[PDB]
Symmetry: D2
């Protein structure tokens, strides 16, 4: 069928949730690839059955064979471990995967999740050989969903009606742009002026946003459901040609004064992949912060070769 | 059942589309009320069957009996004709309807569509006797969907990723705020600066937006599908408690310097109805325009008593 | 984009509803083709805007140019008038349309609605030249939605949980198979035995089902919303590769003892179009009825050449 | 808000998936209750953020406090361990939970998942004190989704277009009724007669269906995504008043010749909970099998008091 083939190179936690969500939305056939034997076949089996409950018809199969990447339309990479000691190592994993992407599905759209994602996405870009508009890393969508949500719960408005922008990198050096936050299209400042939300609050929310994954870990859980949903938001925008403005890690070719590196910025995802890279007209203050994010990305890139 | 009862006081064009959309989304039971005999029963019959195709269970019935308003949770008024000669006349229709709302379903949430809507919504507010937070008029959501769409098609981005604000009134005196237009959360000016969209273009789009209903009429059609979808967006936000920021006609109690009148402004619709009235921090220029819109509303209010 | 192009050859009542539903479900781009000047552009304009309310990105345009059929992936024909005097005439319309389909979009999937549909679908099959698995007529899905719904409202169960089969023809000679009606997978007889629904009731429902369009007309309405939803159910099954079992008019090649004619029967719609034609193992009694339906189809076929 | 409060007494694997699905469908607010400290707060945090990606507004919070059950509209119990040694023990857990349900939310709708579910559901029925129509156990929906899916993949039709019935018990003594399997409303026998599917195949599928959870476990996974989706299908039918025919564990009051026990049978879930208990008109052969299922349920009931 013209049905899209979506291969998940990594069938761990994020892997189960995406499979679940893809059937829920009838986005395409799913391959849960992993190097752990059998488990993917297991998850795939359990997942396959939801087709019934969902009025869906998406094949879900497992795989311990790289060559199942053949004909993949979308590929989503979560494979890897989890310090700077793991870098040369997740780098070896990206290198192996890109080899197989180039061999089996060079025209696939690629989304990288493996952390640190702005480093790792570039690594795979170079080894897979795909065009720059055909590969992005997860980051911005997830990070902003936290900023958007926290604010929405203070202002008692629909979460999606908060817009925000986080750029530069995923991780600790991510840049929260207080200047680009709106509520129902309206500048956030207006709501600060009305004493509906204070600057002190909003600063507590910013640190909360930056520290979320960590907050989740210390509560004896692990962040994987949000990551999943955001990845799928991006994937769906590719498959359905929605042209959503979504913040992802992508190849900078002069934006923000930066080149020959991947960094977080709003892009437009549609049928051609990255159809636009939107550059925010940052002031020097917010550009200084962007610079620190790109510098930490370069630093971990060197630690892996 | 706790299933909501949605009564459509008016089963003409907008009336058929809402019924269709409500079943599509399983929002509630529908009553197509009209004074035209039988027709509502007809539309209701045809509509009822889509329950099958939609995996839905919403009763859809017709009605030539006002007292079918009893127990309505939501009421949506499109009844009326279509000059200032029709005002004292659509006023007599609002007067009759409010009487029945007060008698049969005083705790209903009310949405007025009948034009001119900012006049007519106030008229019904006073005669039905419902609380100020339980009644709004259609206007802003529809008008902005046109502004949002036209821009989206120039910038090649997802329509919903355009946000805009139109206030003051529905109709010719509606106020387009160029200052409050964003794309993927980003100020529109940034995209003007990049020569992706020009000021001359955007001005052509503004006049297009203001003249749409008229453009549709001269193409030998009539605007009713968009009106329908927007009304339902508002209704759904009420029923589901979504707290969406939506621009509707509502009772001004000092905002924009205006009182004892209905005018278009972003509100938050949830379970309590109008849960917030958001006042835009307009400059004098945009406030002068707001004033002209409120003045035309007052002027047609007088022509009906 | 890989986004599907859906052309509606006929932009009247059924035409507006499908456009509406297609955007609602982000199924594809829509062309409202009609021979009436401008009107399609009008409907398309109004419809285009719902993209915003729906989180959708489907182009909707009008057309008075047959050659806009070029590259269409799906084509849905509602064009025509509405006696046996109109046959040689709607036949001339199918002949003109097939010419353009063969010229501009020979690989399109085709759905015929124009009545009488089992005659008219064959007419277009022969003049367009498309493969037998790439063209069906609306009938069964619509007719059964009425049978399913009426029963569901007596048994107080979800409408979709009623299954039924109507075959042979759309129209008065349609064959209701009482033997193939189930509720939640369970034979209807079981519910007759329990005195939850009587044979006399169910017979009243059968005549109701057969006479619905007529019942709708005498209530001063016209049946177009259900037709729309069912057409879209079929179209969606094609586009999404859902392999739904849906009753449509299709080319009989020996089933039910019939050949070289179109008649209503369950088929499976997926990516290859008609992927299976399911033949019901009818007893002689129900086959006698099938025969009368095919005979009326042949009879009106002759009246048009 | 009238927004429903859905409390998940158990925030393990099935627990994360339901939370995910409930936000996806904007079904209500979610409380992830568990006795494990913090973890529920963690999962809830991660989950809460998907509100953004989903256009949703469902609160998701954690809880280590039973009294958070207060005002719950729906309660879904997955708490417990996993031999007949664990019975008197999961029994002590049901006893504690029912105490809190009776105290805090006696009018809640209850769905039991804890295994063995037909035993455990009755246990909670007696200790919570809720009406018989307000409590069911998961079983039939999940089990049939496997039977439906496997068959659908042989016949190449949409999964949901297979209907089947499994009754009596969840677990090894579950009764597969070959006689009540249909495809697109049509008896399965017809498809056996056509040599599209054989009896030997279908028997392999039956044993597959019975052994699925076990098949999933030996592939180094655990069955939790399907269980989740089915539970939510049931919950959604309650909340939305869909009147779906769904097979669940419920109180038998003479059906199948059985009393004063819970067993699997098609029911109709709507606003009143269990609105109907449908009794299948089983022959003696299939009733003998039903009897063995009820006997194993009674046997494990005794092992817990
Ligand atoms: N970019 C982001 O916003 C973001 C957010 C959260 C997590 N993450 C990252 O995503 C990754 C995974 O998250 P998770 O929670 O699913 O982890 P997980 O450990 O549950 O899954 C990783 C899977 O990859 C497998 N694996 C190892 N080598 C492989 C290979 N060559 N091919 C296929 N699979 C291989 C593992 O066995 C495991 O199943 C991590 O690196 C994490 O840091 C990124
Ligand atoms: N506010 C907005 O953004 C907006 C947009 C478009 C249209 N409109 C307005 O909505 C109204 C209707 O639009 P439509 O296209 O559905 O019109 P329509 O003529 O097709 O429907 C109006 C219906 O009301 C009926 N009616 C008259 N008196 C009635 C009564 N007392 N009770 C019930 N029904 C009664 C008519 O018979 C008719 O069926 C008009 O006044 C129009 O100006 C408003
Ligand atoms: N098969 C079914 O189950 C079923 C059910 C209901 C209605 N119908 C049939 O569908 C058809 C239309 O239904 P409707 O309610 O949309 O009717 P409608 O009159 O509102 O629409 C028909 C449209 O076709 C146009 N037309 C005429 N010649 C044309 C051409 N060459 N190209 C494009 N358009 C042309 C007309 O101007 C009109 O806009 C009728 O023939 C009716 O009998 C079929
Ligand atoms: N009926 C069915 O069709 C079906 C299908 C699959 C699984 N199950 C059953 O569902 C149950 C759980 O499945 P899972 O995969 O989510 O298991 P899980 O172990 O991941 O979750 C069970 C949770 O309950 C907790 N718990 C223990 N006592 C508790 C209490 N008093 N209150 C709240 N939580 C408590 C545990 O800490 C754990 O988080 C099992 O008993 C299993 O056998 C039933
Ligand atoms: O959830 C996150 O945001 C996140 C972020 C990061 C960043 C990073 O650099 C390593 C690992 C993780 C793991 C995570 O789960
Ligand atoms: O579609 C519209 O925007 C619109 C607006 C107005 C305004 C008005 O004042 C009268 C009638 C209409 C009718 C309409 O259809
Ligand atoms: O709605 C229907 O079922 C229907 C059926 C038929 C059958 C027919 O033969 C001509 C016209 C119509 C028009 C219709 O609207
Ligand atoms: O998935 C199932 O069907 C299932 C069934 C059963 C039955 C049972 O008796 C105990 C535990 C389980 C666990 C499970 O996961």
């Amino acid at each position: 069928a013209p049905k899209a083939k979506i291969v998940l190179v990594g069938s761990g936690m994020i892997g189960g949730v995406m499979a679940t969500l893809i059937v829920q939305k009838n986005l395409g056939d799913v391959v849960l690839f992993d190097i752990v034997k059998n488990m993917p076949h297991g998850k795939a089996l359990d997942t396959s059955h939801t087709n019934v409950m969902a009025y869906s018809n998406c094949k879900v199969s497992g795989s311990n064979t790289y060559d199942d990447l053949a004909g993949a339309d979308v590929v989503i990479v979560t494979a890897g471990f989890t310090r700077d000691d793991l870098l040369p190592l997740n780098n070896k994993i990206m290198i192996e995967i890109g080899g197989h992407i180039k061999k089996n599905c060079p025209n696939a759209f690629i989304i990288v999740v493996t952390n640190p994602v702005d480093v790792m996405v570039q690594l795979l870009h170079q080894h897979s050989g795909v065009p720059k508009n055909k590969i992005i890393g997860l980051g911005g969508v997830l990070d902003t969903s936290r900023l958007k949500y926290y604010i929405s719960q203070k202002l008692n408005v629909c979460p999606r009606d908060v817009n925000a922008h986080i750029v530069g990198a995923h991780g600790n050096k991510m840049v929260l742009l207080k200047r680009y936050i709106t509520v129902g299209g309206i500048p956030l400042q207006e709501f600060i002026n009305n004493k509906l939300i204070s600057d002190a609050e909003l600063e507590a929310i910013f640190d909360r946003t930056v520290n979320t994954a960590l907050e989740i870990v210390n509560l004896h859980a692990s962040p994987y459901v949000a990551p999943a949903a955001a990845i799928i938001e991006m994937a769906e925008s590719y498959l359905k040609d929605l042209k959503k403005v979504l913040i992802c890690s992508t190849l900078l070719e002069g934006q923000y004064g930066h080149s020959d590196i991947f960094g977080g910025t709003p892009v437009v995802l549609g049928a051609n992949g990255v159809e636009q890279v939107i550059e925010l007209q940052l002031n020097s203050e917010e550009k200084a912060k962007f610079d620190e994010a790109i510098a930490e990305t370069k630093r971990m890139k060197a630690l892996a070769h």
